[PDB]
Design a protein around this ligand. Structure first.
Ligand SMILES: CC(=O)CC(=O)SCCNC(=O)CCNC(=O)[C@H](O)C(C)(C)COP(=O)(O)OP(=O)(O)OC[C@H]1O[C@@H](n2cnc3c(N)ncnc32)[C@H](O)[C@@H]1OP(=O)(O)O
Ligand SMILES: CC(=O)CC(=O)SCCNC(=O)CCNC(=O)[C@H](O)C(C)(C)COP(=O)(O)OP(=O)(O)OC[C@H]1O[C@@H](n2cnc3c(N)ncnc32)[C@H](O)[C@@H]1OP(=O)(O)O
Lengths: 283, 283
């Protein structure tokens, strides 16, 4: 069984995963490059725990009982303690290779190595490690504490065993796991993002105003947020990049990025993270 | 002002519109081909009114006060009484022409003629009537009583005046109105349907199971219903047709129907309305 989870990366995501494993009882060995980054990782887990204490959730005795389980190191032989390591540091391909290569040097043949992503080919990664059959892709969703789902992405090489284990691990963490053969955009992004794109196409064409496009979809398909407002939340540079991956990996102009999405990105109007995108925001 | 609404058609939609105008205070002149169809139209309006009485909504004195306002005829000079007629009988193009041609013979130059649709070119219609500038497209959503939105679709010829009037009419009826230049799929269907299609593409490709695709989108994008389950609700033959219109009207394989959606349709697996589609249902 998997009693001890490895985690390389202590940023937004890695805190997420770690917490999600701790508030359950699994031992996390978290790892990063400085002690500063590591404790900043712990501060966030605690801080988020104290929100839950506040809205009558959990207890004061779990904020405690969890953290005990988080062994947060800056050395990487520490990960031998683990049954599985999840890389959660980077969407940079060449850095990812190194990290996984290094993780692959430390732990034993039978340990599973995972890698969080939204865009990187799981098959292309798995192939850089010693045991490719022991590699699997994961993709958690962005406020990891509360979101109850993971895309589990099988490289061409991932084994049935490697799958079932991490299938079960996810189920323990309290999320429903989707299973997906490695493909550009996996499942969620594959269908969600080309829709966001189609909203930009519609707005580009002069067919309707942004606020009315967004309301159309809200009221018409009872979506929580309209795709444009949503695009502003995700990041229009994050959107363009996904569409570029879609178009490039499938080599099909079906996934042509919208031209207005290109223009906004060139202008720097990237959304909420710059105050201006489809809509204007404060700061 | 528009005190008296014309309605040709007493099926699902026309009952909808009529009610929506009555529960507000506008006089409806409803019209169909038999007396049977007309009263069946009234039975449904009443029946739906009695649900609202039941869940502590409205009153017993509005179930009454509304119906008074519904003048439900089988002659078509009755529509001279009206400030506007809304055609709500048919998605058959050649029948639609006739009806609008006939409606156009009865009412005066300055009366507005609308036409409900999801697929028919508003410009192509408007052009068959005497006053094209007085034509506008409407598209209500399917349980008209409760859905708070209409797509208002300007043919190339619709006037600014014709627009503002029917803009206001919609606002009275209690819906937010979207405004859209006539284009294949208008707004909602234009972006929603190619997404449903992309789910069929994903399932066709062997990437993931239908139930997990659907859950991915539910949990991942907090959508109420997954697109596949949704496709089963809409009708897979209704989906294929929309995609065919998209592909045919834009003349762009970007909107290629999914091949599995074609196959299911050929097999007769059309969804909930036949008991079998993506999923199997009872009967
Ligand atoms: C026409 C074309 O060519 C193409 C098109 O179709 S374009 C328009 C189609 N687009 C669509 O999105 C259609 C489907 N609509 C949706 O999915 C909407 O987002 C939505 C209205 C369903 C969202 O609402 P939701 O949060 O899922 O509420 P939902 O529960 O589904 O509402 C339906 C009601 O029917 C009721 N109902 C009636 N009979 C019932 C039964 N036998 N069993 C269970 N529920 C029943 C339910 O109780 C429910 O009301 P409450 O939940 O308030 O009690
Ligand atoms: C990574 C990639 O490359 C590509 C991708 O991004 S793929 C994944 C992205 N996909 C997404 O769908 C991202 C966006 N997610 C969604 O829209 C989800 O459907 C959703 C979680 C927002 C749906 O939930 P919802 O019904 O809209 O709830 P919502 O209110 O938005 O939840 C956010 C919480 O933040 C809270 N919040 C925190 N600070 C706040 C503030 N200053 N003001 C207001 N609210 C605040 C809110 O209170 C809210 O909780 P409650 O409503 O329960 O109080």
């Amino acid at each position: 069984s998997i009693r001890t989870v490895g985690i390389v990366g202590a940023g937004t995501m890695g805190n997420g995963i770690a917490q999600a494993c701790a508030v359950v009882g699994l031992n996390v060995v978290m790892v990063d490059i400085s002690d500063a980054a590591v404790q900043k990782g712990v501060a966030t887990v605690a801080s988020s725990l104290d929100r839950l204490i506040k809205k009558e959730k959990l207890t004061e005795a779990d904020k405690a009982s969890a953290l005990a389980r988080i062994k947060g190191s800056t050395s990487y032989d520490d990960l031998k303690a683990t049954d599985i390591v999840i890389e959660a540091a980077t969407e940079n391909y060449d850095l990812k290779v190194k990290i996984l290569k290094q993780i692959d040097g430390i732990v034993g043949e039978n340990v599973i190595i995972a890698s969080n992503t939204s865009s990187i080919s799981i098959t292309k990664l798995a192939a850089v490690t010693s045991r490719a059959d022991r590699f699997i892709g994961m993709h958690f969703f962005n406020p990891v504490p509360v979101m109850a789902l993971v895309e589990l992405i099988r490289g061409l090489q991932t084994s049935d065993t490697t799958h079932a284990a991490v299938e079960a691990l996810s189920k323990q963490l309290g999320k429903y796991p989707i299973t997906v053969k490695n493909s550009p955009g996996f499942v969620v992004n594959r269908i969600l993002c080309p829709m966001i794109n189609e909203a930009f196409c519609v707005l580009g064409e002069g067919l309707a105003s942004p606020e009315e496009i967004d309301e159309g979809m809200k009221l018409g398909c009872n979506h929580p947020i309209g795709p444009l407002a949503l695009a502003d939340m995700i990041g229009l540079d994050t959107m363009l990049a996904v569409m570029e991956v879609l178009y490039t990996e499938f080599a099909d102009p079906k996934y042509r990025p919208a031209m207005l999405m290109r223009e906004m990105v060139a202008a720097g109007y990237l959304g909420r993270k710059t105050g201006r995108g489809v809509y204007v925001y404060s700061k």
